From Swiss-Prot:
It holds the Pfam family NAD_binding_1. It comes from Pisum sativum (Garden pea). Keywords: Chloroplast, Electron transport, FAD, Flavoprotein, Membrane, NADP, Oxidoreductase, Photosynthesis, Plastid, Thylakoid, Transit peptide, Transport. Pathway: Energy metabolism; photosynthesis. Monomer. Interacts with TIC62 (via C-terminus). GO terms for cellular component: chloroplast stroma; chloroplast thylakoid membrane. FAD binds at R87, L88, Y89, S90, C108, V109, K110, Y114, V125, C126, S127, T166. One of its GO terms (biological process) is photosynthesis. FNR is probably attached to the membrane by a specific binding protein. Signal peptide: none annotated. This is Ferredoxin--NADP reductase, leaf isozyme, chloroplastic. It catalyses: 2 reduced [2Fe-2S]-[ferredoxin] + NADP(+) + H(+) = 2 oxidized [2Fe-2S]-[ferredoxin] + NADPH.
């Protein structure tokens, strides 16, 4: 008698792809050092700000999956001669990545530029270091991090993706795995519906890629853009993400009542409210309380949020 079955720890059941997931392999103490393969501006010269897509070599050392983030320790020192703290960035590439070899990682980065009260133009440290990164240069990577935005295991589930700006990143990751890749253990056949809010047409992130996916899965891939500074509803209201969702109120509510519907939200912290305003009305007319219904969804792993 050399064996025994040690009593199992009690554990919560998960509908998301978390089998053998990995977080915090690399710490800022000793980050993984990768290199820049490419770094391109994906927004028009005319857009209000610049958004860049960049790819780094990982030689397969960072075991990330769709929905996770990585931290970046930008080169340099702060005002006190100290190294910079890491900044997190949502992975914009699928697990196998942009080269299809599982040895790279991609980021979608907004270059932060603003002016303080003193009237001075200020440049965000990490975002400007990243957008200025030249191919061939090293970059310090930490993580992976996150489990909230992991994809659902069900290959026939409806996945509603709500994003603003660079919040599109994890959704480009999901969609590549869903429509640009042939997976043995996972071939997507549900409904993927993406809503993306950006300020202008020159700001439509990954427009061409999404159009190729629509042209490849015209039935089960739905795409709706909400261009806030160019589009307007019948009342002249700016077309924010919730304003566009409003045009499909009946359908979305109907999907939200389905048990295989998962909603994911990523991007601006403020997008969360307009969406709830929209939802509270629908549930109301349906004699349902969104407050309570949302709680259920969240506990059922069907209302996933990662905003900041
Ligand atoms: C989980 C997670 C994932 C993220 N993923 C992404 C991603 O994929 N892409 C992406 O672009 N960003 C992402 N971010 C944000 C990112 O981590 C950085 O915060 C961002 O790039 C800005 O950092 P920075 O180092 O450039 O700026 P910093 O040097 O840190 O400066 C930011 C500071 O400047 C001030 N500030 C910022 N904006 C303004 C403004 N308009 N006016 C006045 N003051 C201002 C604030 O005090 C703020 O604390 C994510 C955030 C989190 C938490
Ligand atoms: N995992 C995470 O937590 C992630 C978080 N983020 C967060 O998102 C930020 C990226 O923003 P960036 O790409 O510059 O986006 P933007 O400032 O470019 O704007 C995004 C779009 O959303 C609109 N918008 C602004 N406020 C709201 C609101 N309250 N409700 C609905 N729509 C709104 C804007 O309209 P208009 O400009 O006309 O007002 C704009 O069209 C990052 O700095 C980060 O903080 C990004 C990626 C991942």
């Amino acid at each position: 008698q050399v064996t025994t079955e040690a009593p199992a720890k009690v554990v919560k059941h998960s509908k998301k792809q978390d089998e053998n997931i990995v977080v915090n392999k690399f710490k800022p103490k000793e980050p993984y050092v990768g290199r820049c393969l490419l770094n391109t501006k994906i927004t028009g010269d005319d857009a209000p700000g610049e958004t860049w897509h960049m790819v780094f070599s990982t030689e397969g050392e960072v075991p990330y999956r769709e929905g996770q983030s990585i931290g970046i320790v930008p080169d340099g020192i702060d005002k006190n001669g100290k190294p910079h703290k890491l900044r997190l960035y949502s992975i914009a590439s699928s697990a196998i990545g942009d080269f299809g070899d599982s040895k790279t990682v991609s980021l979608c980065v907004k270059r932060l530029v603003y002016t303080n009260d003193a009237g001075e133009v200020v440049k965000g440290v990490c975002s400007n270091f990243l957008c200025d990164l030249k191919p061939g240069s090293e970059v310090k990577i930490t993580g992976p991090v996150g489990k909230e935005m992991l994809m659902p295991k069900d290959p026939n589930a409806t996945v509603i993706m709500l994003g603003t700006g660079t919040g599109i990143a994890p959704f480009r990751s999901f969609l590549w795995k869903m429509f640009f890749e042939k997976h043995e253990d996972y071939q997507f056949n549900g409904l993927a519906w993406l809503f993306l809010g950006v300020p202008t047409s020159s700001s439509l992130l990954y427009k061409e890629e999404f159009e190729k996916m629509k042209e490849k899965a015209p039935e089960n891939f739905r795409l709706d853009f909400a261009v806030s500074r160019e589009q307007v509803n019948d009342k002249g209201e700016k077309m924010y993400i919730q304003t566009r969702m409003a045009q499909y109120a009946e359908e979305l509510w109907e999907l939200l009542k389905k048990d295989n519907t998962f909603v994911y939200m990523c991007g601006l912290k403020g997008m969360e409210k307009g969406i709830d305003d929209i939802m509270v009305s629908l549930a109301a007319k349906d004699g349902i309380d969104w407050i309570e219904y949302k709680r259920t969804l969240k506990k059922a792993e069907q209302w996933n949020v990662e905003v900041s």
